[PDB]
Symmetry: C3
Subunit: 36 residues, 3 copies
């Protein structure tokens, strides 16, 4: 249905933003190893 | 159209879950370098 | 509305593809540390 797709998309957006933060967190740890 | 958007979203969901697994795989390799 | 959801989804797709590239970029740096 229509509303279930609205929510699916909102959930998808929040998952991608959480994965962007995890990526930023990993990049910080990598840069420490690469320059520390 | 409507159905093409249903599928687009399903495809988007599966890509994000695959990227989450790749992220977990990279985090494991990073943690080995950081603590090994 | 309907069109705002069309665009939301397109924006979501492009964010995930940008995060895939960042992931590939990080994986390359990790592999250098792991094998260099
Ligand atoms: Hg994503
Ligand atoms: Zn660096
Ligand atoms: Zn650690
Ligand atoms: Zn390797």
């Amino acid at each position: 249905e229509w509303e279930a797709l609205e929510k699916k998309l909102a959930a998808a957006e929040s998952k991608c933003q959480a994965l962007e933060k995890k990526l930023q967190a990993l990049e910080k740890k990598l840069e420490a190893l690469e320059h520390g």
